[PDB]
Amino acid sequence: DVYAQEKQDFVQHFSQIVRVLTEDEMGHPEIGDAIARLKEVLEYNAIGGKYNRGLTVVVAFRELVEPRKQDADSLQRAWTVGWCVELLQAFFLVADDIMDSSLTRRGQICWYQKPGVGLDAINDANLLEACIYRLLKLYCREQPYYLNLIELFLQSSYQTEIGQTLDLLTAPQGNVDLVRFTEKRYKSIVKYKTAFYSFYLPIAAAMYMAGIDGEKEHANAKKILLEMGEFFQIQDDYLDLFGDPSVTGKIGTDIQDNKCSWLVVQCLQRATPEQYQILKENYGQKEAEKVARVKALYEELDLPAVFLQYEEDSYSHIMALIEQYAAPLPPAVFLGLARKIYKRRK
Amino acid sequence: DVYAQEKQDFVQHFSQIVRVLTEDEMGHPEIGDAIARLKEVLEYNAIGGKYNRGLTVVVAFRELVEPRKQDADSLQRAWTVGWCVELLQAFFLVADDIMDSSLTRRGQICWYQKPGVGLDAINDANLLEACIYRLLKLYCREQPYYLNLIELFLQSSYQTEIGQTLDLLTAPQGNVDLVRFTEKRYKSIVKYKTAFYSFYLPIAAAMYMAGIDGEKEHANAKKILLEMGEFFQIQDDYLDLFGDPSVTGKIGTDIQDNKCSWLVVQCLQRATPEQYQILKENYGQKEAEKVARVKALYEELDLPAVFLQYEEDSYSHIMALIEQYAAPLPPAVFLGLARKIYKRRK
Ligand SMILES: O=P(O)(O)C(O)(Cn1ccnc1)P(=O)(O)O
Numbered sequence: 001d002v003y004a005q006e007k008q009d010f011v012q013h014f015s016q017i018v019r020v021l022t023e024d025e026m027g028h029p030e031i032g033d034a035i036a037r038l039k040e041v042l043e044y045n046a047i048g049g050k051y052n053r054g055l056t057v058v059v060a061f062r063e064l065v066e067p068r069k070q071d072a073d074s075l076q077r078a079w080t081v082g083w084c085v086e087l088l089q090a091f092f093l094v095a096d097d098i099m100d101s102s103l104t105r106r107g108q109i110c111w112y113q114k115p116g117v118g119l120d121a122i123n124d125a126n127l128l129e130a131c132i133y134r135l136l137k138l139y140c141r142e143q144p145y146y147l148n149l150i151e152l153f154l155q156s157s158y159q160t161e162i163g164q165t166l167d168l169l170t171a172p173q174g175n176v177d178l179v180r181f182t183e184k185r186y187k188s189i190v191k192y193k194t195a196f197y198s199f200y201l202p203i204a205a206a207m208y209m210a211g212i213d214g215e216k217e218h219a220n221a222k223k224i225l226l227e228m229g230e231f232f233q234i235q236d237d238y239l240d241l242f243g244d245p246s247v248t249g250k251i252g253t254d255i256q257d258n259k260c261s262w263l264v265v266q267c268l269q270r271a272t273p274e275q276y277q278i279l280k281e282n283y284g285q286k287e288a289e290k291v292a293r294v295k296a297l298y299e300e301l302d303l304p305a306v307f308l309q310y311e312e313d314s315y316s317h318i319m320a321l322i323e324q325y326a327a328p329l330p331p332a333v334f335l336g337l338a339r340k341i342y343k344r345r346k
Numbered sequence: 347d348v349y350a351q352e353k354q355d356f357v358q359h360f361s362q363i364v365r366v367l368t369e370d371e372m373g374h375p376e377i378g379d380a381i382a383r384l385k386e387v388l389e390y391n392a393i394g395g396k397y398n399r400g401l402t403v404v405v406a407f408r409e410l411v412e413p414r415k416q417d418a419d420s421l422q423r424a425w426t427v428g429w430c431v432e433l434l435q436a437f438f439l440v441a442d443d444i445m446d447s448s449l450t451r452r453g454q455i456c457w458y459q460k461p462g463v464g465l466d467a468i469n470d471a472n473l474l475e476a477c478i479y480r481l482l483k484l485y486c487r488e489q490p491y492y493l494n495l496i497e498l499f500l501q502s503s504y505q506t507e508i509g510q511t512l513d514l515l516t517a518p519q520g521n522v523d524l525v526r527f528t529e530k531r532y533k534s535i536v537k538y539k540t541a542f543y544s545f546y547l548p549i550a551a552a553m554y555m556a557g558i559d560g561e562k563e564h565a566n567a568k569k570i571l572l573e574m575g576e577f578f579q580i581q582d583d584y585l586d587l588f589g590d591p592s593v594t595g596k597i598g599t600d601i602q603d604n605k606c607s608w609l610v611v612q613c614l615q616r617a618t619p620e621q622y623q624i625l626k627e628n629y630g631q632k633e634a635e636k637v638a639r640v641k642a643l644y645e646e647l648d649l650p651a652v653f654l655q656y657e658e659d660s661y662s663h664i665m666a667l668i669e670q671y672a673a674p675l676p677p678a679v680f681l682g683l684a685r686k687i688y689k690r691r692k
């Protein structure tokens with residue numbers, strides 16, 4: 001509901017984000033064509049998702065700053081930073097689609113597959129990351145939280161980068177190993193590859209902008225938000241295989257890529273010895289025939305129910321933690337976000 | 347000579363760079379395997395070049411700080427930052443080899459071609475970039491130039507990123523257009539893709555660490571160093587086609603990739619109408635037969651002499667600029683670097 005009413009404001013402010021990025025260097029008409037492609041890149045990769053992260057920065061701001069201080073300028077910084085988290089999303093997604101050999105994202109062909117693009121997407125992605133800090137300097141160079149934000153973004157990027165590495169080491173194409181698809185490994189992977197950038201980044205950005213920079217308060221908000229991250233990745237691993245691609249906006253690839261997905265981990269735990277061998281014979285291959293064999297053993301082990309039960313048990317634990325750790329922050333902050341991902345299908 | 351005596355110190359300090367990066371997160375043994383691959387990545391991509399940029403940071407430091415202040419700690423920051431510019435080099439090169447479809451770098455198979463690696467190099471490269479700011483915080487979090495350095499690196503990355511985009515837009519594989527291979531375009535491309543990160547970054551880092559942060563002094567050092575950048579790229583475009591790959595450490599690819607190389611631009615200027623058509627028919631194709639046809643028309647137009655004459659005329663203009671703009675800095679600073687790239691073959 002709150003993301004709903006703020007969504008439109010958020011998106012309309014994207015025109016300006018683009019204006020500022022594609023003009024601040026246009027007094028150098030030499031790099032104009034380059035700046036032109038940047039507009040194009042942003043428009044294609046920054047737009048089309050749910051904006052949960054960017055909205056979260058904005059929503060969390062309004063709930064942590066006394067309305068006497070939510071002035072005109074200060075409010076603008078909120079959605080610029082919200083759009084900065086949105087650009088981090090774009091950076092990492094463009095890269096990840098290349099690396100996961102994905103076909104669609106946000107219900108279009110992935111950037112790297114847009115004809116004319118391909119592996120130039122690599123440079124396009126770095127550019128997206130570069131813009132984060134262009135905006136940060138443009139709109140906050142003078143706030144006292146300016147250095148806190150630069151470091152929170154850098155730090156978060158590094159973290160998810162470690163995550164991605166963890167992700168990729170565990171899923172060697174051609175090296176089907178199920179032994180490594182454990183639980184400690186999964187929790188570690190999703191923590192670094194999703195949790196920090198998708199939940200602690202937005203809320204922490206809003207805290208630092210609202211003066212809330214105590215170490216314990218971030219430590220506590222993080223304790224909640226990292227647990228929401230893992231929930232959120234597990235939802236995503238599920239939808240990879242069990243969701244409608246016309247609705248997720250992306251065609252799933254986890255089983256083919258030999259990914260340490262939640263399912264394959266929960267599948268190993270319930271694996272009768274015969275089934276294990278079936279999993280060992282079909283996982284991590286591009287053959288449709290073999291992939292469906294996998295889906296089948298998932299459905300034979302009623303995992304699609306285990307996921308629904310985890311979802312409940314998990315959602316209540318998050319709740320418990322919001323009840324344990326939220327204060328002095330408004331529980332609205334964490335409830336609002338958590339309510340926006342419960343049962344989701346995209 | 348000065349890079350010579352400082353080289354070894356510089357390289358030996360790499361053991362510690364690696365120690366600090368692969369231990370500061372090892373109190374989290376979960377991401378240990380990831381941290382393991384980071385060691386591996388660094389060792390493969392940070393090591394093996396000439397270290398001109400990193401040495402430059404170090405050499406330029408010793409020449410701008412009164413020896414009374416070149417203490418133990420302060421000196422360590424110098425080569426850490428020198429190694430940070432070295433990591434930026436690695437970041438961009440790993441990416442560029444993928445995008446240029448290169449085969450070797452620094453006399454080994456490119457990272458992305460190391461079997462087991464491929465497009466995961468994309469994430470490995472981002473990690474390299476991430477380490478820059480890990481070190482920056484580890485060793486300078488408390489210097490007064492701390493924010494100046496973070497912004498100089500970010501800014502320089504963005505700049506070379508615009509450059510790379512400029513580079514790639516101009517060289518569409520399959521779209522052989524010679525009309526775009528002009529001079530204004532070339533100067534613009536090399537300025538952003540090489541000049542800022544390879545010459546202004548190192549020297550400016552050393553200036554900021556030595557307190558020299560006046561706007562005019564950086565503006566003047568930049569005026570010299572941007573002109574050295576263009577010289578240096580033109581040398582590189584030449585060696586691409588006319589240098590021994592066993593000595594450059596890399597197999598050239600400019601003609602195949604349809605690159606706006608210096609040669610092809612100087613070739614268009616001297617193109618009799620018949621030759622132009624020959625260029626139009628062979629440029630930007632992978633066929634060895636057609637590539638050599640190109641090399642031939644270059645040698646028919648004695649470009650390998652035009653490059654030697656540019657080299658002289660250019661080197662003297664740099665000299666003039668060191669004589670015009672160096673002060674209050676020691677001309678040694680700019681002479682030292684410029685003397686380390688004159689006539690180079692690798
Ligand atoms: O499942 P992935 O981790 O590859 C993914 O969730 C992206 N991602 C990457 C890090 N965190 C999330 P996507 O399904 O959107 O391709």
Ligand SMILES: O=P(O)(O)C(O)(Cn1ccnc1)P(=O)(O)O
Nearest residue numbers: 442443446448539540582583586
């Ligand atoms: O010639 P490129 O610009 O591709 C190169 O010089 C790398 N580079 C990229 C930007 N600046 C330099 P390399 O020959 O080393 O592949």
Ligand SMILES: C=C(C)CCOP(=O)(O)OP(=O)(O)O
Nearest residue numbers: 049050051089106194236346
């Ligand atoms: C960590 C994950 C699952 C990456 C995609 O997340 P979202 O589905 O929330 O990304 P948007 O397309 O809405 O940006």
Ligand SMILES: C=C(C)CCOP(=O)(O)OP(=O)(O)O
Nearest residue numbers: 395396397435452540582692
């Ligand atoms: C801009 C260019 C030419 C990239 C390679 O430069 P260097 O040849 O100086 O890189 P190193 O391998 O010595 O790092």
Ligand SMILES: [Mg+2]
Nearest residue numbers: 096097100167
């Ligand atoms: Mg992925």
Ligand SMILES: [Mg+2]
Nearest residue numbers: 096097100102
């Ligand atoms: Mg993916």
Ligand SMILES: [Mg+2]
Nearest residue numbers: 236237240254
């Ligand atoms: Mg997924």
Ligand SMILES: [Mg+2]
Nearest residue numbers: 442443446513
């Ligand atoms: Mg290149």
Ligand SMILES: [Mg+2]
Nearest residue numbers: 442443446448
């Ligand atoms: Mg190259």
Ligand SMILES: [Mg+2]
Nearest residue numbers: 582583586600
């Ligand atoms: Mg080159």
